[PDB]
Amino acid sequence: AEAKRLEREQKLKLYQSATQAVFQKRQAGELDESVLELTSQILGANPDFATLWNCRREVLQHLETEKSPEESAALVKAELGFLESCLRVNPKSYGTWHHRCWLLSRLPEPNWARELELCARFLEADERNFHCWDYRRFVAAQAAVAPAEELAFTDSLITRNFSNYSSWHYRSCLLPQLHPQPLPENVLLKELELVQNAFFTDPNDQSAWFYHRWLLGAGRCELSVEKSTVLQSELESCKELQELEPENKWCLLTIILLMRALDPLLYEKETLQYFSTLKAVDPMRAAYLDDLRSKFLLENSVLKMEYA
Amino acid sequence: QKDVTIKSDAPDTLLLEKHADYIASYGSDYEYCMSEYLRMSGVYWGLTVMDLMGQLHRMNKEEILVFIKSCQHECGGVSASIGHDPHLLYTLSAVQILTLYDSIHVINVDKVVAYVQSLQKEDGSFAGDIWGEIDTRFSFCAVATLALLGKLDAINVEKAIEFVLSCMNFDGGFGCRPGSESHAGQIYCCTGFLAITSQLHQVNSDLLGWWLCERQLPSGGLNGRPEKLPDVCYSWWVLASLKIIGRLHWIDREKLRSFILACQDEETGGFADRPGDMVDPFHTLFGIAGLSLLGEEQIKPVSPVFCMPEEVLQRVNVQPELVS
Ligand SMILES: O=C(N[C@H](Cc1ccc(O)cc1)C(=O)N[C@@H](Cc1ccccc1)C(=O)N[C@@H](Cc1ccc(O)cc1)C(=O)O)OCc1ccccc1
Numbered sequence: 197a198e199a200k201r202l203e204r205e206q207k208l209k210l211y212q213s214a215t216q217a218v219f220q221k222r223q224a225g226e227l228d229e230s231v232l233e234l235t236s237q238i239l240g241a242n243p244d245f246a247t248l249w250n251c252r253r254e255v256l257q258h259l260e261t262e263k264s265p266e267e268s269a270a271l272v273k274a275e276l277g278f279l280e281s282c283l284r285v286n287p288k289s290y291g292t293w294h295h296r297c298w299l300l301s302r303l304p305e306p307n308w309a310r311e312l313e314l315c316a317r318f319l320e321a322d323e324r325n326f327h328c329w330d331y332r333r334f335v336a337a338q339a340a341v342a343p344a345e346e347l348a349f350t351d352s353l354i355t356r357n358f359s360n361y362s363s364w365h366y367r368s369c370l371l372p373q374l375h376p377q378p379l380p381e382n383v384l385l386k387e388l389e390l391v392q393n394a395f396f397t398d399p400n401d402q403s404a405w406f407y408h409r410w411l412l413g414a415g416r417c418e419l420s421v422e423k424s425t426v427l428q429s430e431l432e433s434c435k436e437l438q439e440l441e442p443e444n445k446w447c448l449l450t451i452i453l454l455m456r457a458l459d460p461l462l463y464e465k466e467t468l469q470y471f472s473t474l475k476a477v478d479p480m481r482a483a484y485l486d487d488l489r490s491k492f493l494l495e496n497s498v499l500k501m502e503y504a
Numbered sequence: 505q506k507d508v509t510i511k512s513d514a515p516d517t518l519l520l521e522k523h524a525d526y527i528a529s530y531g532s533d534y535e536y537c538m539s540e541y542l543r544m545s546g547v548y549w550g551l552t553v554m555d556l557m558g559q560l561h562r563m564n565k566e567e568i569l570v571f572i573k574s575c576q577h578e579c580g581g582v583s584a585s586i587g588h589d590p591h592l593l594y595t596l597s598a599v600q601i602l603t604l605y606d607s608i609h610v611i612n613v614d615k616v617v618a619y620v621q622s623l624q625k626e627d628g629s630f631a632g633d634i635w636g637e638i639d640t641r642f643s644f645c646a647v648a649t650l651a652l653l654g655k656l657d658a659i660n661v662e663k664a665i666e667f668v669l670s671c672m673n674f675d676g677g678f679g680c681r682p683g684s685e686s687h688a689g690q691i692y693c694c695t696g697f698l699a700i701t702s703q704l705h706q707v708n709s710d711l712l713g714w715w716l717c718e719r720q721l722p723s724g725g726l727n728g729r730p731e732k733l734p735d736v737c738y739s740w741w742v743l744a745s746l747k748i749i750g751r752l753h754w755i756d757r758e759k760l761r762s763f764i765l766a767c768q769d770e771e772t773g774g775f776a777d778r779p780g781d782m783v784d785p786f787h788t789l790f791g792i793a794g795l796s797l798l799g800e801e802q803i804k805p806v807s808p809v810f811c812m813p814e815e816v817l818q819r820v821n822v823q824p825e826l827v828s
């Protein structure tokens with residue numbers, strides 16, 4: 197333990213001494229290579245130290261006007277490497293990712309296809325890394341990638357693994373872009389089929405249940421006979437799944453929302469039954485469920501006063 | 505599925521006096537100096553939690569005020585520490601502290617305002633500093649700073665609202681930027697922003713409240729998004745978010761309280777991340793703030809918007825109407 201203490205006490209002396217020298221160098225106005233090596237040392241272990249990323253940027257900006265095209269091109273490739281080594285160690289620092297956009301945003305021809313491949317690498321390591329997905333969205337835009345490949349990219353990632361909340365969210369933003377209206381039914385139906393598949397494959401998979409609730413709201417009876425049969429078919433599949441997972445709260449809730457989506461008043465008795473079974477399985481959500489049930493019983497009272 | 509398991513001999517009692525002493529003594533270590541890059545906010549967290557416990561006098565006002573004036577730069581923004589660079593985050597923290605102390609003219613208020621104004625973009629967003637990072641975190645830092653100062657009118661508020669709303673997602677939550685996935689820390693920033701700008705009627709509270717309350721794991725702790733482990737930080741953000749939107753009761757208050765108390769270190773004091781992990785002033789503030797919002801009578805009432813004593817906000821006449 198004393199060697200671990202003493203080394204970290206020195207890593208201090210070294211983090212502290214390097215930090216000190218960087219700031220000394222900064223008032224002085226020595227915007228040079230010295231600073232890049234010192235910050236290279238500090239930023240590797242603490243990339244949340246934001247001021248130092250700023251120094252690096254300042255040095256690099258100064259040397260775009262003391263070095264040649266070639267010398268400056270070498271500096272950025274060196275910066276790219278540095279960045280990638282910083283990300284392997286902390287793939288979740290805001291400053292590292294923003295420095296990478298900063299750098300790439302000011303290059304002449306940047307290799308965006310390289311950068312999209314980097315995101316695919318980082319996303320197989322951590323499919324939930326929101327910083328990586330945000331960076332991927334930046335690279336896609338900077339490089340005028342079309343919503344269809346990004347949507348094709350999302351097809352892959354769901355089937356491959358079960359860390360899909362981030363992928364289903366991306367789908368939720370991409371589909372509106374394929375059909376830009378201030379969802380079409382054919383599309384809704386196709387997406388409804390992807391999602392049930394996902395949650396019968398793995399019923400404990402909460403992300404698909406959440407995406408599915410969105411799909412249910414996304415545009416009564418103006419229920420076509422197709423949609424009406426698809427929803428009815430979804431309802432029985434969840435009952436089947438309820439017999440298999442009596443503890444599964446997500447399919448129970450979904451059953452309630454399906455019946456709402458079909459016919460509030462006709463399925464009123466079973467909705468009430470379903471709320472009680474559900475509150476018995478998910479007691480922590482007791483209050484939410486009572487409030488949902490009250491909201492629906494109000495809607496059911498409004499629908500009945502529209503009578504004759 | 506992923507959850508912490510609380511031990512039977514984790515604390516179930518509130519150790520106020522241990523926490524005050526922990527905060528009163530914090531700063532007299534290793535990760536203390538490793539965290540100089542967020543010193544200003546670190547000071548905010550300690551000061552704020554001490555004041556929530558009525559123990560503010562035990563901190564060094566005079567010293568802290570000098571530190572602050574020396575952290576304001578010529579652009580008018582404020583840095584995290586001396587010699588570090590200005591940023592919206594530390595500008596917020598400095599103004600929150602100056603407001604705790606009724607001492608805002610310690611800094612140049614007009615310069616701060618201009619600084620905050622300078623960082624707004626065409627589409628209504630805010631950059632964190634001159635290097636251009638856009639994040640709804642900074643939309644909150646700007647309007648939070650400006651409202652504690654009475655200068656919300658200084659920025660294009662309509663465009664700011666429009667940007668924040670473009671970050672609203674299919675699940676009723678918010679992320680960093682348009683297209684960004686929903687996350688509890690971003691939900692807190694955006695709902696706090698909409699509270700300040702009077703736009704809570706634009707939130708789908710039942711849909712967002714559902715997403716939020718599904719954060720609570722069987723341990724009683726809350727996570728920041730699906731599949732993640734619960735902790736005290738996410739516990740504050742979610743709860744505070746729920747309270748802003750009128751839905752704090754959608755959570756099991758008893759189970760959450762007990763989670764938070766299990767995060768106390770009964771020997772050293774302070775609060776930790778999750779039970780028996782190592783304590784810090786960040787989770788100490790958010791543990792105490794979280795317990796106050798749940799209704800702990802030993803702790804002053806805490807604003808879920810500014811994460812400051814209500815009584816502080818009452819003095820300066822800034823109290824956003826919340827949903828319900
Ligand atoms: O950056 C943050 N939040 C903190 C740290 C912080 C807070 C205030 C500051 O002035 C400076 C740093 C944070 O933990 N961020 C989060 C995410 C987030 C996103 C949006 C909104 C809130 C949180 C984060 O990335 N945390 C990381 C690591 C981390 C953990 C603790 C910490 O203090 C800083 C970073 C993790 O959870 O692993 O957002 C600013 C903010 C939040 C709430 C109120 C005002 C301002």
Ligand SMILES: [Zn+2]
Nearest residue numbers: 735737738777
């Ligand atoms: Zn945390």
